[PDB]
Amino acid sequence: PNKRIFQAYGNAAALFVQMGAYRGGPTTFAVVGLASKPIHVFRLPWYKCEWISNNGSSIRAKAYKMLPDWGYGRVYTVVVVNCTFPVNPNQDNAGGRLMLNAYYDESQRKYEKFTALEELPGSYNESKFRPPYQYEYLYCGSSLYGNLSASRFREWMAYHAWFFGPSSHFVFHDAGGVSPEVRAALDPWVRAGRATVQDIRGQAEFDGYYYNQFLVVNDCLHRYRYSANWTFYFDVDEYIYLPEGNTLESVLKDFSNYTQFTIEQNPMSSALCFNDSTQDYPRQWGFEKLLFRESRTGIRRDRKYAIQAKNAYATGVHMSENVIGKTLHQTETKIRYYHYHNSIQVPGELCREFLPLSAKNNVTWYNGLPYVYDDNMKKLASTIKDFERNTIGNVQAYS
Amino acid sequence: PNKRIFQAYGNAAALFVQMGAYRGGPTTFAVVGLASKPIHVFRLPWYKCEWISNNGSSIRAKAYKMLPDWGYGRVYTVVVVNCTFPVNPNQDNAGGRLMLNAYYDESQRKYEKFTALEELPGSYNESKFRPPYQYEYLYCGSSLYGNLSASRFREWMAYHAWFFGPSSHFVFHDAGGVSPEVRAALDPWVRAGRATVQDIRGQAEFDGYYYNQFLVVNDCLHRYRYSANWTFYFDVDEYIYLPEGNTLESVLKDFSNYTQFTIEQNPMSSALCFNDSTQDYPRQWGFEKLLFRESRTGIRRDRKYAIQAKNAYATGVHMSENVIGKTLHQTETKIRYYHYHNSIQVPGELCREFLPLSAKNNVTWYNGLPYVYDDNMKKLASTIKDFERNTIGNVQAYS
Numbered sequence: 001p002n003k004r005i006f007q008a009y010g011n012a013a014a015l016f017v018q019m020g021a022y023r024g025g026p027t028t029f030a031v032v033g034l035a036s037k038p039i040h041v042f043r044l045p046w047y048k049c050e051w052i053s054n055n056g057s058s059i060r061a062k063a064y065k066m067l068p069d070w071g072y073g074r075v076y077t078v079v080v081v082n083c084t085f086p087v088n089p090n091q092d093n094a095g096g097r098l099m100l101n102a103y104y105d106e107s108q109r110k111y112e113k114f115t116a117l118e119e120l121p122g123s124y125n126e127s128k129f130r131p132p133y134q135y136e137y138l139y140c141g142s143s144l145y146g147n148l149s150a151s152r153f154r155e156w157m158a159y160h161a162w163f164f165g166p167s168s169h170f171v172f173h174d175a176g177g178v179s180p181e182v183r184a185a186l187d188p189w190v191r192a193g194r195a196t197v198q199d200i201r202g203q204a205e206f207d208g209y210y211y212n213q214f215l216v217v218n219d220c221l222h223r224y225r226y227s228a229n230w231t232f233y234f235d236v237d238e239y240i241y242l243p244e245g246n247t248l249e250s251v252l253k254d255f256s257n258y259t260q261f262t263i264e265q266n267p268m269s270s271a272l273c274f275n276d277s278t279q280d281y282p283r284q285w286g287f288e289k290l291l292f293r294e295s296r297t298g299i300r301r302d303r304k305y306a307i308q309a310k311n312a313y314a315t316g317v318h319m320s321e322n323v324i325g326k327t328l329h330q331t332e333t334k335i336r337y338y339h340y341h342n343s344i345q346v347p348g349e350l351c352r353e354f355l356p357l358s359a360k361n362n363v364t365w366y367n368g369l370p371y372v373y374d375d376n377m378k379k380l381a382s383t384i385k386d387f388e389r390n391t392i393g394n395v396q397a398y399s
Numbered sequence: 400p401n402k403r404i405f406q407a408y409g410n411a412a413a414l415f416v417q418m419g420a421y422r423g424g425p426t427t428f429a430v431v432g433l434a435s436k437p438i439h440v441f442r443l444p445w446y447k448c449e450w451i452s453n454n455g456s457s458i459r460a461k462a463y464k465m466l467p468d469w470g471y472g473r474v475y476t477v478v479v480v481n482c483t484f485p486v487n488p489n490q491d492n493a494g495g496r497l498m499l500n501a502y503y504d505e506s507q508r509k510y511e512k513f514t515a516l517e518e519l520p521g522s523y524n525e526s527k528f529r530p531p532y533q534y535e536y537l538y539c540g541s542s543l544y545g546n547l548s549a550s551r552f553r554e555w556m557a558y559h560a561w562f563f564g565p566s567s568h569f570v571f572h573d574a575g576g577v578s579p580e581v582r583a584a585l586d587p588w589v590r591a592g593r594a595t596v597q598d599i600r601g602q603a604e605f606d607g608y609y610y611n612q613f614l615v616v617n618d619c620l621h622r623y624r625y626s627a628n629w630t631f632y633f634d635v636d637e638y639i640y641l642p643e644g645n646t647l648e649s650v651l652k653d654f655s656n657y658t659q660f661t662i663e664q665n666p667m668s669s670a671l672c673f674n675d676s677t678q679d680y681p682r683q684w685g686f687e688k689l690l691f692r693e694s695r696t697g698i699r700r701d702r703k704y705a706i707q708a709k710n711a712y713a714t715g716v717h718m719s720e721n722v723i724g725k726t727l728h729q730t731e732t733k734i735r736y737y738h739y740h741n742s743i744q745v746p747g748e749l750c751r752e753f754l755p756l757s758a759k760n761n762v763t764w765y766n767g768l769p770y771v772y773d774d775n776m777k778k779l780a781s782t783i784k785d786f787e788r789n790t791i792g793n794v795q796a797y798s
């Protein structure tokens with residue numbers, strides 16, 4: 001009769017979207033994902049962790065979350081959910097399953113209870129929670145999307161496989177940017193077991209509902225938490241450099257006590273080149289031809305960083321506020337990165353202007369900004385192209 | 400394998416929660432309900448409307464929403480969706496249904512389509528949108544919650560059936576506040592066809608997630624759009640008064656060219672009576688005993704209002720911001736309402752602090768505020784108590 005029903009439709013925001021769950025220790029696990037944040041009502045607790053072994057019983061875990069993203073301006077906010085136990089709930093190894101009880105608020109009493117990961121009988125090995133690990137170094141790619149130049153990927157990979165050396169791996173996160181031509185440029189390296197391309201294209205369901213680059217670096221953290229002593233975070237338009245008088249290990253022992261440290265930026269124009277009738281720029285590598293560096297006395301610029309994934313719990317895109325140990329922001333003239341800005345989505349020849357010969361010595365001004373000469377990367381170009389041969393061969397060898 | 404699964408559970412916000420849907424004219428409809436307000440994402444449209452005729456032919460309307468509440472500070476926001484067609488979509492009276500689409504954002508990828516109302520064959524009556532209407536006056540009560548005094552419903556109901564005359568109807572909204580004691584006080588007026596009690600007790604599922612009173616007033620505005628010439632919004636601790644020399648018709652004809660007019664408040668103390676042994680307080684009505692109006696001047700206080708719902712599109716709790724035609728605020732000279740504030744929950748006797756007869760003529764102080772003797776309402780007590788007896792019989796005594 002006058003009985004007013006209320007009819008709810010749709011799911012404007014789910015409570016928790018689980019992308020990955022990873023064991024991050026004998027006692028502590030991880031669930032990286034997305035959280036809708038509440039409005040005007042609590043959420044104590046946000047989550048709860050269990051472990052249901054095949055023995056039937058169950059133990060409770062201490063559950064605390066972090067918001068290593070902004071935390072406003074998106075429907076969801078990236079959440080890292082920490083489940084630490086007093087005892088390893090499965091070195092019994094009779095099987096087990098990680099639960100997660102996710103609560104809307106403190107007043108209503110229905111919830112969501114699901115499985116985050118499962119461990120089958122006889123699938124555990126502590127020996128890889130301790131040295132040795134797979135690699136010394138592991139590169140964490142961004143969420144790849146857009147129209148991306150395969151030539152940059154070939155050049156970036158050849159360079160950084162040489163930089164990080166033989167015991168390094170590169171992880172990439174295809175969210176649509178890994179075109180067939182990009183693939184063909186990763187193809188040599190994944191054949192060699194040096195690169196991994198995860199398909200995160202199912203992400204299109206939440207595109208715009210959370211911070212895409214935060215979620216990727218939180219998962220790459222725990223999916224490969226013990227895979228390498230160091231885990232680097234930067235983009236394929238960034239190239240790690242070292243002013244001369246530095247080995248990668250000679251800069252690593254000096255930083256051996258710091259679990260995370262920043263890298264300062266060499267912002268390079270992606271258009272400035274030299275006017276030269278004899279330089280055949282269409283067959284020069286990107287960093288070999290863009291020789292002009294935004295060279296300004298101390299203006300705060302973007303960072304990247306590395307981190308001992310063993311000793312962290314969440315991170316951001318420029319550094320971590322979720323670690324144990326101290327950070328080293330003082331790594332300026334000791335390790336750098338070259339950042340060719342807006343070069344990867346550029347279709348065609350990067351050399352889109354031509355400076356006079358004089359620019360090599362004098363400070364030239366472009367787009368209201370000044371630039372200088374910097375052939376530090378140019379100098380390394382023939383070492384790389386030669387290392388490319390001895391590692392994967394020609395790229396007219398795919399490989 | 401490394402193909403990642405974005406797996407989502409729970410629902411922390413429906414995209415739309417329908418409370419009601421009504422025809423507001425030969426060509427126009429309104430859906431009243433709750434909406435989940437977006438974040439960062441473009442949402443345009445929020446909605447669109449179609450009419451699907453019984454024989455399969457469709458016709459979409461132009462749809463626009465209105466947000467009568469504040470539009471921030473809650474998981475949900477009150478929304479009135481207006482659908483207007485280029486023709487009566489059920490002209491031939493063959494029947495059909497009003498369909499509504501709710502969008503999550505602009506990618507317009509996923510969407511929610513659902514039936515808002517249905518009109519059975521032959522059911523469309525064009526004379527219900529032409530005078531005469533069912534009542535002259537219609538009252539829209541607020542959302543009733545808490546422990547309410549049945550004795551006040553008796554008194555308020557008696558007064559206002561008298562005040563509005565026979566050609567008026569009263570709509571109450573039961574959100575848990577209508578107790579069995581309150582039901583019996585309303586019962587003779589329900590049996591007399593003068594009062595309706597709607598059961599809105601479902602809104603407690605979403606309680607704390609939107610603005611409760613903003614939902615009731617819009618729904619009542621549209622469910623009764625053409626039931627009456629004037630719709631009055633006020634609470635049952637509030638009594639419309641004509642500073643006399645003014646019949647209600649005479650007042651309303653002076654305002655007939657205005658789509659809505661507001662009404663200023665006489666604040667009355669709910670804890671304050673004569674110290675008098677000749678008076679028999681437990682058997683006198685509230686407005687008969689509480690004779691002291693707060694007398695501070697130039698104090699802006701909440702207002703109430705009346706409205707010609709036929710010329711209004713959405714409303715609020717103190718007036719509408721969505722009408723055609725003008726609005727009148729200088730009504731102090733001929734219509735007011737007495738507000739017995741914090742009088743409706745009070746269990747037991749309202750007379751709780753007593754004053755000498757020197758308060759009839761001086762200015763009384765209590766709790767920092769001043770008060771003056773006002774007997775306009777008490778003068779009408781014996782007239783109401785009669786009127787009650789003549790209209791609903793011998794209600795029994797003692798409040």
Ligand SMILES: *[C@@H]1O[C@H](CO)[C@@H](O[C@@H]2O[C@H](CO)[C@@H](O[C@@H]3O[C@H](CO[C@H]4O[C@H](CO)[C@@H](O)[C@H](O)[C@@H]4O)[C@@H](O)[C@H](O[C@H]4O[C@H](CO)[C@@H](O)[C@H](O)[C@@H]4O[C@H]4O[C@H](CO)[C@@H](O)[C@H](O)[C@@H]4O[C@H]4O[C@H](CO)[C@@H](O)[C@H](O)[C@@H]4O)[C@@H]3O)[C@H](O)[C@H]2NC(C)=O)[C@H](O)[C@H]1NC(C)=O
Nearest residue numbers: 024028029030082084256257258259310311312313324325
């Ligand atoms: C969820 O949250 C919980 C809690 O919030 C997380 O659990 C915590 O995780 C922490 C990091 O994983 C962990 O802290 C580490 O514990 C290690 C093991 O501890 C055992 O040994 C130490 C003695 O070393 C005992 O005191 C302890 O009781 C245990 O028996 C430690 O080894 C770690 O110490 C190192 O890091 C700290 C912090 O920077 C340094 O101050 C310290 O000096 C150690 O530094 C060495 O290692 C770092 C890099 O790891 C180097 O930078 C440094 O130069 C040192 O390197 C030398 O030493 C190593 C040997 O470690 C040697 O091999 C190398 O060659 C060098 O010579 C660290 O303290 C918490 O205990 C743990 N708490 C709980 C309750 O679980 C959980 O992880 C979260 N989950 C997720 C998924 O994130």
Ligand SMILES: *[C@@H]1O[C@H](CO)[C@@H](O[C@@H]2O[C@H](CO)[C@@H](O[C@@H]3O[C@H](CO[C@H]4O[C@H](CO)[C@@H](O)[C@H](O)[C@@H]4O)[C@@H](O)[C@H](O[C@H]4O[C@H](CO)[C@@H](O)[C@H](O)[C@@H]4O[C@H]4O[C@H](CO)[C@@H](O)[C@H](O)[C@@H]4O[C@H]4O[C@H](CO)[C@@H](O)[C@H](O)[C@@H]4O)[C@@H]3O)[C@H](O)[C@H]2NC(C)=O)[C@H](O)[C@H]1NC(C)=O
Nearest residue numbers: 423427428429481483655656657658709710712723724725
């Ligand atoms: C969804 O939204 C849409 C819009 O976004 C809503 O649609 C709009 O709804 C409006 C409200 O009804 C409507 O406006 C009214 O239209 C009435 C019908 O107009 C038709 O006849 C006239 C001929 O004069 C044509 O010009 C017109 O185009 C149509 O053919 C009008 O009659 C209404 O006018 C009255 O109100 C306005 C505004 O106050 C006055 O300016 C005007 O003078 C009229 O005033 C008389 O009536 C009011 C009370 O209604 C009195 O206050 C006033 O004193 C006058 O009273 C004398 O006259 C009346 C006869 O009208 C008589 O009974 C009385 O005794 C007095 O002698 C008004 O303008 C929009 O046209 C309409 N637009 C569209 C595009 O749809 C829709 O409702 C929404 N739906 C929902 C569900 O919310």
Ligand SMILES: *[C@@H]1O[C@H](CO)[C@@H](O[C@@H]2O[C@H](CO)[C@@H](O)[C@H](O)[C@H]2NC(C)=O)[C@H](O)[C@H]1NC(C)=O
Nearest residue numbers: 529530531532533534535536566626627628629
């Ligand atoms: C609502 O107001 C309308 C408009 O004034 C009333 O209808 C008018 O009534 C008078 C007197 O009975 C007639 O002379 C007019 O011709 C009517 N107008 C129209 C357009 O028909 C109506 O009486 C009021 N509604 C109710 C229920 O009383």
Ligand SMILES: *[C@@H]1O[C@H](CO)[C@@H](O)[C@H](O)[C@H]1NC(C)=O
Nearest residue numbers: 145146147148177345346347
């Ligand atoms: C890539 O190019 C296509 C067509 O040229 C365009 O539609 C698309 O928006 C581009 N993507 C980006 C990220 O610019």
Ligand SMILES: *[C@@H]1O[C@H](CO)[C@@H](O)[C@H](O)[C@H]1NC(C)=O
Nearest residue numbers: 274275276277353354355356
């Ligand atoms: C570059 O040099 C060529 C010939 O050497 C000349 O025609 C041209 O004007 C110079 N400048 C630019 C911007 O091409």
Ligand SMILES: *[C@@H]1O[C@H](CO)[C@@H](O)[C@H](O)[C@H]1NC(C)=O
Nearest residue numbers: 256257258259324325326327
């Ligand atoms: C190494 O780091 C620890 C913090 O984990 C700090 O207490 C200690 O002083 C550091 N040692 C040196 C030599 O900097």
Ligand SMILES: *[C@@H]1O[C@H](CO)[C@@H](O)[C@H](O)[C@H]1NC(C)=O
Nearest residue numbers: 544545546547576744745746
């Ligand atoms: C009604 O009374 C009960 C106890 O008598 C109390 O718990 C509740 O809060 C009261 N309601 C209101 C609205 O105060």
Ligand SMILES: *[C@@H]1O[C@H](CO)[C@@H](O)[C@H](O)[C@H]1NC(C)=O
Nearest residue numbers: 673674675676752753754755
């Ligand atoms: C009211 O009057 C009575 C007797 O007239 C007196 O005893 C009492 O103190 C007065 N005040 C109150 C609050 O009852």
Ligand SMILES: *[C@@H]1O[C@H](CO)[C@@H](O)[C@H](O)[C@H]1NC(C)=O
Nearest residue numbers: 655656657658723724725726
């Ligand atoms: C009546 O209302 C209309 C607005 O709808 C206004 O234009 C007109 O001036 C008003 N008439 C009087 C006499 O106030």
Ligand SMILES: [Mn+2]
Nearest residue numbers: 235237341342
């Ligand atoms: Mn960049």
Ligand SMILES: [Mn+2]
Nearest residue numbers: 636739740741
């Ligand atoms: Mn009140």
